[PDB]
Design a protein around this ligand. Sequence first.
Ligand SMILES: Nc1ncnc2c1ncn2[C@@H]1O[C@H](COP(=O)(O)OP(=O)(O)OP(=O)(O)O)[C@@H](O)[C@H]1O
Ligand SMILES: Nc1ncnc2c1ncn2[C@@H]1O[C@H](COP(=O)(O)OP(=O)(O)OP(=O)(O)O)[C@@H](O)[C@H]1O
Ligand SMILES: Nc1ncnc2c1ncn2[C@@H]1O[C@H](COP(=O)(O)OP(=O)(O)OP(=O)(O)O)[C@@H](O)[C@H]1O
Ligand SMILES: Nc1ncnc2c1ncn2[C@@H]1O[C@H](COP(=O)(O)OP(=O)(O)OP(=O)(O)O)[C@@H](O)[C@H]1O
Lengths: 386, 386, 388, 388
Amino acid sequence: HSAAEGRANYFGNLQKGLLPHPGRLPKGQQANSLLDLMTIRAFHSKILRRFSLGTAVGFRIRKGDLTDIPAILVFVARKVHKKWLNPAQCLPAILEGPGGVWCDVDVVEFSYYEQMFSELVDKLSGSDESIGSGSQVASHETFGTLGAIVKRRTGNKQVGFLTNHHVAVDLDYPNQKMFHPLPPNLGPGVYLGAVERATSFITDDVWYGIYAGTNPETFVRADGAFIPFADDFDISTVTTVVRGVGDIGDVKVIDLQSPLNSLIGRQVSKVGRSSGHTTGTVMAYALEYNDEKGISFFTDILVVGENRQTFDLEGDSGSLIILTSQDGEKPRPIGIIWGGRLKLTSDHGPENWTSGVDLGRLLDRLELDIIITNESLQDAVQQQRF
Amino acid sequence: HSAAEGRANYFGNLQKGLLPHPGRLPKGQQANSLLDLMTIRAFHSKILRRFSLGTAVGFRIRKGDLTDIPAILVFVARKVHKKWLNPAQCLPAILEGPGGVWCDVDVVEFSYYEQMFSELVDKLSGSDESIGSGSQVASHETFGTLGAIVKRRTGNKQVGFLTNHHVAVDLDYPNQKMFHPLPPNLGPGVYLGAVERATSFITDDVWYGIYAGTNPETFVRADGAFIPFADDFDISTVTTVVRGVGDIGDVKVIDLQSPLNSLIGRQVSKVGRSSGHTTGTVMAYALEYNDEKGISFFTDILVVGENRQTFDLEGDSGSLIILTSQDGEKPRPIGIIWGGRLKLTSDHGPENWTSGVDLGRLLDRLELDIIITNESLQDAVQQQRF
Amino acid sequence: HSAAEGRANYFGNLQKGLLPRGRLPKGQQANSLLDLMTIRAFHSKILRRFSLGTAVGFRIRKGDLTDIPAILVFVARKVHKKWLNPAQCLPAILEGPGGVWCDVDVVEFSYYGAPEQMFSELVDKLSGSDESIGSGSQVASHETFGTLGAIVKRRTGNKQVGFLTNHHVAVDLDYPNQKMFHPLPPNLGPGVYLGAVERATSFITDDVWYGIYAGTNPETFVRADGAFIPFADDFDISTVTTVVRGVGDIGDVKVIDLQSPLNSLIGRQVSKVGRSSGHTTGTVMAYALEYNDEKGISFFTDILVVGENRQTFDLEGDSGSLIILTSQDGEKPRPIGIIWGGRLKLTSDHGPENWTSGVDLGRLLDRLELDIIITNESLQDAVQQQRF
Amino acid sequence: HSAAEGRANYFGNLQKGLLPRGRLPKGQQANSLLDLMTIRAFHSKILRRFSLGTAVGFRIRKGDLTDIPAILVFVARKVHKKWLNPAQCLPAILEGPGGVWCDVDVVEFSYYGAPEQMFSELVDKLSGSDESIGSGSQVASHETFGTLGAIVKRRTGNKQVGFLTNHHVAVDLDYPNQKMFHPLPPNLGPGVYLGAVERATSFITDDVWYGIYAGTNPETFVRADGAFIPFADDFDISTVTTVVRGVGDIGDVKVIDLQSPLNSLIGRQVSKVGRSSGHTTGTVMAYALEYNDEKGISFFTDILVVGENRQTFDLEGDSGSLIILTSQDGEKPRPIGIIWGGRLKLTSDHGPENWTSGVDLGRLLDRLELDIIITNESLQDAVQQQRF
Ligand SMILES: Nc1ncnc2c1ncn2[C@@H]1O[C@H](COP(=O)(O)OP(=O)(O)OP(=O)(O)O)[C@@H](O)[C@H]1O
Ligand SMILES: Nc1ncnc2c1ncn2[C@@H]1O[C@H](COP(=O)(O)OP(=O)(O)OP(=O)(O)O)[C@@H](O)[C@H]1O
Ligand SMILES: Nc1ncnc2c1ncn2[C@@H]1O[C@H](COP(=O)(O)OP(=O)(O)OP(=O)(O)O)[C@@H](O)[C@H]1O
Ligand SMILES: Nc1ncnc2c1ncn2[C@@H]1O[C@H](COP(=O)(O)OP(=O)(O)OP(=O)(O)O)[C@@H](O)[C@H]1O
């Protein structure tokens, strides 16, 4: 009947099919997928969530370096030696899931707690003759980054752009009008259009396809806004190139059944109005944060910048998170930056961390397709007039 | 085609059917309706909006007292003698509309810029055994007032309550759950339900049925939230009585073609969690405020408290604005308080002013009906189970 | 061995001998402060949950003090039973360990208090326009202003004569010697040197103060603000008066016995004379108030006073003031406490009233080994005995 | 009659004799500051709209100074033409009243400036560790700290010897006599009394200062900060040095003639020595900068300087410092201004640089009737002439 009663039933039967190892290697299959790790974390949510700030899935971190061992990352405010912790507080090293699928449990010091100057940043902020990924999109109050030139799959098949919802939508005013570079009250700019569809919170069952936690009120922070280009807008100013990266391919969907090496540990790049071109590493997926109001919130992609340099700054929200080319293939996008420190090494200090929204799932919810070539763009314009 | 092009056409033809009095009494018909005053104000919006903070329609105010002369109230920050004003600044005394309908122009000093203790306030805040109009409804952050026990007209015909949207809906979190008296993080309370439909901004053409201004971006601040009662909620705790007023009748719709005496100048009463029972006078309708972002905003009902006492305080939002009985008839509701001073007399200081939303139009937009007797309530419960 | 192990033993014994009970024997009804404190101590856990604090006294119904012995439970918002969870709703009666039973009253209440200016002849006199120093006089260190509570003499030792005030005003341990002046310190204005603090109390454990375990917390401390300032050698005792201005000549300290009828303290009219509000009257509403912080420590305050006719009993700066019972049969009024270094809602018609906190004078005088001087002859005699 | 009616006449005449023009005669290109200022004055309205301010100088292209005479127009955000309204986009060339034409350059620019500490031997010396007082020395009133600009002598009257600094630092008209000390005022630290301000300039009208109508505003004023502090009678002149520490011996003031080639000022390297940043170098980027407030008044600043190698030319406290041209052919370096009591974006690669404001020294010296002393012999001679 109710979604809560359905979720309680699913976890009820997982407990009902259960049985209880003297230091022997786990007999069950080791996790090799994101779904495997997420299922184990869901079953053991309560005592993972206790004495913890959040949880995520990925590979174990040892001495600041990413291993190849699938793991549930448990985030703590202060990581101390086991000798100073109570036996209840010390988290396990291995967790056994419902169907025998097992994984490791890593502990990472973590907290949920500037404008860079380059030729690119100048171009993205209004000096370039073209609008594209990275361009500063602004409403009358907030500044953000254009993520992708998109077209609607159904209906009018309208051509527009995708960015983060918080930057585009402020539901304290009637229309949400977007301009580049600045809105009329703050500076020069051209009217791009208004937000027509937006997503803020999606339930985990619809987003991931599985129950990612025990909380009846569990929502994914799926920030996303589609702005159809205005009728008077000139599409010849639009480019499908990601400046600083080049021509990109189509969205790479995050399949929960694929090997973790396909996402976790992969190098990613982003181009935004505030920090320009940065590179980073995907460190975790499906981060869980529990507020004081009883709601469990999920963020898809967790990225840490490379070489102890921040991956994003305030204003890079909406930027496209693009996988780097491994085999000469065109780099493919996997996420957008959502609207934050972790301590990896003892020698150095805390590094910054950023959040991303799964692009494939966001594009599905908003029923949007990414335009990756100029030929496709002009074709999509013609299809819109149709 | 576009709504702006339709609005521009309507005002274009009104200008096209035009012609130009030596102090002779206006030959046209004097306004006798809200629509008449609103049409004249719409035609002359520009130079009424210039050298002004806002405009509204009602009766002229002379020496602090309400006259019987239909008028367009022009609100100014400082009212000075004509000798100290430039000829362009001095507003006219009479304005002639498109079809010869004429009205007067009144000038009122105005600005858009506490908990009372009584037995009633205590009952409304959680000491009474019943929930009804006036009861403190609270989300996890904002406190407000329950306006009316309502039932949906169509669909499931669900029974719930009406309050102001801003108090119930905060679109920074997934669900908007309402409790009485307090939410779980701040104190004891019972779960009432969650918001299922809400209205924030309606265009003037849909709300009023006419173009109330020349601005292409013109919206009515029609704050409203319907919260269907939870399945587990006990309806025997619900009362249809307005404590401090008694049994009330059905909504009195504000017809724009009725004589102005039916609304302007009428005594109204409200019962809220913060100020309790207060009385006031309806002073104006369809107040226009122009922001710095180019959007024209409209508020329906303007109320000033009687005897220089405030009509509302922060927290009375959602309260039902009820007309007082003139002929022994049950008092009938006309509005809800929306989520502020005017100088009427020289002897005393500035009085406070409050805003109301047209209940008939809000009930139509949300497709809701007010329940005014316990028999009707239990009948509506049975119809919901149906 | 440890006090915690002794306290844990005491409550473990009470649980072991407990025989649970419907309607319960009348005549086993509490008639003492100790009776109410023992019941509250046993049921500390279930009372401390969903509550800001507890105290013992008389049940309050419709804002008026009844004669029914009760444990007052203080809540941030008092709501109707229908909006409460069954676990949240408090009992109306609680049976103690030995079958002694009492009532459980609920009061809306807040701790939002750290401690304005009232203008009268007394306030002016207390602040430095009187030719005499006594109870109510402004005592000032270099930073904080307070009120002189009582002219006192030490029981043992040199038997020195000085005055009593609150310790948080007198002692600021960030510097070595705490010097008091009247009216003002030399950095802010004119004044004479009264002396320096020689002994002070801040926290006493409940087993020492009350003589019983008032709670289950291994860390339970009574906020017993108290400071003795022996008068300086050069100080002129002829400037000192033992009269409480606004009340007159006072009797000796009235000790608060826990076995006496609650009538003797709860509900009694009290008066105070302080530098900030002058003469005010109030009513003792509760005894032994428990507050649980976020750091796990339980704190106790002795006397709770609410001003009469919806007027505040004290203001910031009145700390140190003597809380004095009113005369009932013409007897000289007798002091029972000092104001410690705060709102409750009693009536639905009116708004929240302020509450103030008092320290048990008899127990503070015992810990500090001080005696109150109530007549000028006793003063001069004590000055001579100090020289002896 | 009125200055406004005279100014309105001047521009009414220029419009009446104006013969509008495609490509326009080269050789009628501006070659002077006056030429650029006259074109900007005529076109003030269309330039002041959509702009934060204007100045005259050389066009800037790709962050480098060109040799093309231009009116620099300062904008909060410089965007590509495609995101601009046709009315918003500025011209590339503007023809003046008499056919004299110039270019129109756009620069990102902000007025976010009211005026840190740099550590060096010079700064220490200027702040009170040197045995001599001169240009760069910290001059202090009881509230504000500044920089001694130049040792000066009055041309007429008693011909008294004193020093020149900025008036906002020297004069605070909320009290009668403005006393200067070095290094510090008596309320804050040690120091010797230098003297009190006897004459000061704050606002001069543009017709008096420049000799022309620099704008169409009836209310147009040049921010001409300047204060003369005659040395006290008791002051010891042997402590005064005419050397600019960090530069050496300087020549006499180089006047800024509006009819001279822009090469003579725009783009020239300048140096300054102040109490806060010490010795810094910069480049003169523009002259006669116009700022329009919200109260309807147009204000003008003479010299605009940007520091070299992306380092700030000045800091708060450097006001009063002498802006000194660098030597080109071994000649003694000559002063051209003083720093008035501020960011621009030149390059896309790097970030916003700071800009500072200077007052025309030759015109400030004229209004205040002062002459600069550039050698110790001239100093002592002037001391004797004052006694005469
Ligand atoms: N609740 C907790 N809060 C803080 N620290 C904890 C907690 N539980 C365990 N720890 C600490 O975390 C350690 C485990 O760290 P982790 O699982 O990351 O180890 P690792 O990957 O083998 O090595 P490395 O420490 O290099 O990452 C425990 O030994 C203990 O010191
Ligand atoms: N733009 C304006 N700003 C301020 N004051 C104005 C403006 N235009 C007109 N007024 C003032 O308002 C006056 C008109 O006031 P109004 O129309 O309310 O008069 P009334 O109703 O006859 O009398 P009363 O002043 O008693 O209300 C003018 O005479 C003038 O002094
Ligand atoms: N945990 C709680 N938090 C808030 N309110 C509570 C709580 N438990 C009980 N109450 C409220 O307090 C009421 C009991 O109040 P109380 O003990 O003061 O009664 P009383 O002395 O008979 O009457 P009066 O309300 O007139 O003082 C309950 O009926 C309920 O409405
Ligand atoms: N009102 C305005 N606000 C902001 N930017 C403007 C405005 N008017 C013009 N611009 C921008 O300034 C440009 C002209 O800049 P400018 O005069 O400095 O050119 P330049 O000297 O040839 O080159 P550079 O940009 O390298 O300095 C226009 O093409 C347009 O992009």
